[PDB]
């Protein structure tokens, strides 16, 4: 965020100068990563089993 | 005391153009220069005069 | 233009071997290319490539 | 010491500006991998 | 560019295996850069001069 300040009123003091201030932004990233598994089984076990 | 170009981050977006992404494809010389014979199997015999 | 009477063909696919030849002159009635199978494409998704 | 205040010195100025970019498409072609689309004739530096 | 090869035909030879090859791409960038000049002059010189 920027900062405001109380200005004062002078042609010649350090105050009476309106101060400069910045605003800034940053970057956040979604990066897609892969999660996986392989589960092997015999065809005859699939055929002989009483469930899917 | 100021907003730099590095301080707006990805409010500045880099562009993409495919105007430089193209290559002409070049065929075989010998398929264009000579006769193409349709073969139905691995080998063809051609008799020629020899003496 | 000097090569009148010839049908001229220029290699553009990088196959030319400039250390071997400048040009071939041929009777094109006497060369055949047999095309048994044109370029065919298979999509592989389960296969194994290489060994060890 | 080099400062010019324009209004205080009764001066004006023009600021002129432009923004440019350049790209050379050094690329593969049907001839191979790293092919440059420009060549140069350089001057004769060799006395006869 | 990719490379193709003459495969031949065997179940057991080091030939008869089709070789693998890649294709690849690279990136080129346009990046804008600013070029500028400031040319100051006295208002009296502008007012006295016989041309714009």
TrEMBL record, chain B:
<protein>
    <submittedName>
        <fullName>Major capsid protein</fullName>
    </submittedName>
</protein>
